[PDB]
From Swiss-Prot, chain A:
This is THO complex subunit THP2. Present with 2840 molecules/cell in log phase SD medium. It comes from Saccharomyces cerevisiae (strain ATCC 204508 / S288c). Component of the THO complex, which is composed of HPR1, MFT1, THO2 and THP2. Together with SUB2, TEX1 and YRA1, THO forms the transcription/export (TREX) complex. THO associates with DNA and RNA in vitro. It comes from the Eukaryota. The chain holds residues 158 to 235 of 261 of the full protein. It is found in: Nucleus. Component the THO subcomplex of the TREX complex, which operates in coupling transcription elongation to mRNA export. The THO complex is recruited to transcribed genes and moves along the gene with the elongating polymerase during transcription. THO is important for stabilizing nascent RNA in the RNA polymerase II elongation complex by preventing formation of DNA:RNA hybrids behind the elongating polymerase.
Curated annotation (Swiss-Prot), chain B:
It comes from Saccharomyces cerevisiae (strain ATCC 204508 / S288c). Component the THO subcomplex of the TREX complex, which operates in coupling transcription elongation to mRNA export. The THO complex is recruited to transcribed genes and moves along the gene with the elongating polymerase during transcription. THO is important for stabilizing nascent RNA in the RNA polymerase II elongation complex by preventing formation of DNA:RNA hybrids behind the elongating polymerase. This is THO complex subunit MFT1. Present with 5910 molecules/cell in log phase SD medium. Component of the THO complex, which is composed of HPR1, MFT1, THO2 and THP2. Together with SUB2, TEX1 and YRA1, THO forms the transcription/export (TREX) complex. THO associates with DNA and RNA in vitro. It is found in: Nucleus.
UniProtKB/Swiss-Prot annotation, chain C:
This is Protein TEX1. GO terms for cellular component: THO complex; THO complex part of transcription export complex; transcription export complex. WD repeats lie at residues 33-72, 130-169, 179-218, 223-262, 265-304. Keywords: Nucleus, Repeat, Transcription, Transcription regulation, WD repeat. GO terms for molecular function: mRNA binding. One of its GO terms (biological process) is mRNA export from nucleus. Belongs to the THOC3 family. The chain holds residues 22 to 376 of 422 of the full protein. It comes from the Eukaryota. Component of the transcription/export (TREX) complex and the THO complex.
Amino acid sequence: EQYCAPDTDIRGVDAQIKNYLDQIKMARAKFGLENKYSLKERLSTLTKELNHWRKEWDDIEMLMFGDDAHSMKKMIQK
Amino acid sequence: KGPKELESINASMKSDIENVRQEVSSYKEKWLRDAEIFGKITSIFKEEL
Amino acid sequence: SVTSKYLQSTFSKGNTSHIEDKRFIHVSSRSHITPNEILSLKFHVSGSSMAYSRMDGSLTVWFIKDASFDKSVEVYIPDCCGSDKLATDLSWNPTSLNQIAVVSNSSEISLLLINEKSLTASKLRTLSLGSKTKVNTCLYDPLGNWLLAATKSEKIYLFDVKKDHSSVCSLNISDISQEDNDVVYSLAWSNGGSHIFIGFKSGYLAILKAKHGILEVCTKIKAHTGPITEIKMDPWGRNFITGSIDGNCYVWNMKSLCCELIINDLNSAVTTLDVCHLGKILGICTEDEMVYFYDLNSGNLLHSKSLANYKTDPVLKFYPDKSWYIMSGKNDTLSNHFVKNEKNLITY
């Protein structure tokens, strides 16, 4: 909108457009570079560890269910 | 991709890593407690075997 | 008339590939038997995976990476969910990229995360309910927010998938039907989990509200005069399609809940139906071993075919990310369809 302003000059506004463009490129590139590497690595590692821990918890629950079934086995023994 | 979507997915990945760490710690504590109880029970079984 | 030419080209000499599964090579070896079945077949949301379960007990899953299944890996697995029990329904969990829910007409719902590097399908978790309860259908809210499990009678369960599948609520079917010995035949979710559409056998159709995790009966309309077979929704979200066994296929307006368009050339029962991801073409598989392709906007027949007594029970499904459709073949063998130079109708 500053282009069609009464007193403004074109060259300064073109410079401001160049500066805005560079700022946009820089911010987008910084956020992308930060988001890709570290976030991907940490997410993958945490996901693997969480899956392993959930498998261990399911194994413990299966052992508890095995004890519950051994209760019925001993009951059948009588 | 666009900067807004970039910031959005970055925040989403951060929150996901945080929640994953929290849930992993919780599940690890639960599995540790259950495995401790199971080992306390199975000590006698191992001694007998 | 562009769509008619497109469908004709999709039924041509080329532009077709046989999905090479175990049954396919079996028939190739024994032909160059009693066909078991295809219990169910359901895509992933992102259109890059497929899963289905025969009657033998083995469920195949493909990781689509090619058109004619050239480089598509295949994780074959033996009779999962027990050796005696076979799978009947599965949902693909739109939340993540690998999880799967499977039900086997028993009191146990199995959550398995399929891996693609190896061929190992590792059981991640099992969910259990009352001992007598025999659920056989599972569903996922298209946003991955709720899970639904239904019995043939007197049980409906809703779990909150976010909070580690904590049992959120349940409901007795006799409270929904209020008729003489009704058996839920088909369920479906609304676009964005807000309402559940249920089709009983006596003919009724019910709309339940599932907003904040508490089921409730919103309304019940006497839609059909026979059991309702399938219930599908339009992807744009303006009308929902109901197909019955009495030979009728209606499309109901979503905002007002009143019949708007009727398919009248039909003279037989409907076994399944599906509508493309663009909400433009409607495929009906009737009971006389014949398929039809109608136009959603106008309601006039635009293509017919004939199964010709090959694989009596057919299946149809339209890709969720392209205008291609998997259709059964001769002896329980799947048959892809494409044009190989048109990803979507618009490009045509």
